[PDB]
Amino acid sequence: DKDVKYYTLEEIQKHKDSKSTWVILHHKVYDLTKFLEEHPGGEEVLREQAGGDATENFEDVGHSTDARELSKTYIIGELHPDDRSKIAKPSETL
């Protein structure tokens, strides 16, 4: 009973205060404003992203016992297709 709600890039970037913010993860939006105070133990959560090539080290371990990735119960919607390079030309993609 849920529908993916796409959010423009201006709305995902406008949220840059310090706590209430979201994070992209392979074409997707993660409203993790509560994740900051939901699992106190992993620092890479909403932190590992200084490079800017691909969010792969967003989370490894530190949940229950062998959780693959908590990234799933904190998503709000997906990324608008108007920004996804797949309409006129590829440019970034090849």
Report the binding-site residues.
Answer: 39, 63
Q: What CATH code is carried by the domain that includes residue 43? A: 3.10.120.10
The beta-strand segments (E) located in 1-94 are 22-24, 29-31
Tell me the two tokens of residue 43: 């620092």
Report the binding-site residues for heme.
Answer: 39, 63
Method: NMR
Q: Rg for the chain (alpha carbons), in Å?
A: 14
Domain housing 84:
1-94
Closest C-alpha among 47, 32, 42 to residue 62? 42
Total domains, the chain:
1
CB of 93 within 8 A of CB of 83? no
Q: What is the dihedral of CA 59, 84, 31, 7, to 10 degrees?
A: 180
Tell me the two tokens of residue 74: 């904190």
**Under 8 Å CB-to-CB from 62, ≥6 apart: which residues?**
39, 41, 42
Tell me the two tokens of residue 57: 């080290």
- Give the integer Cα–Cα distance in Å for 74 and 17: 18
> For the chain, give me the number of helices (H) and strands (E)?
1, 2
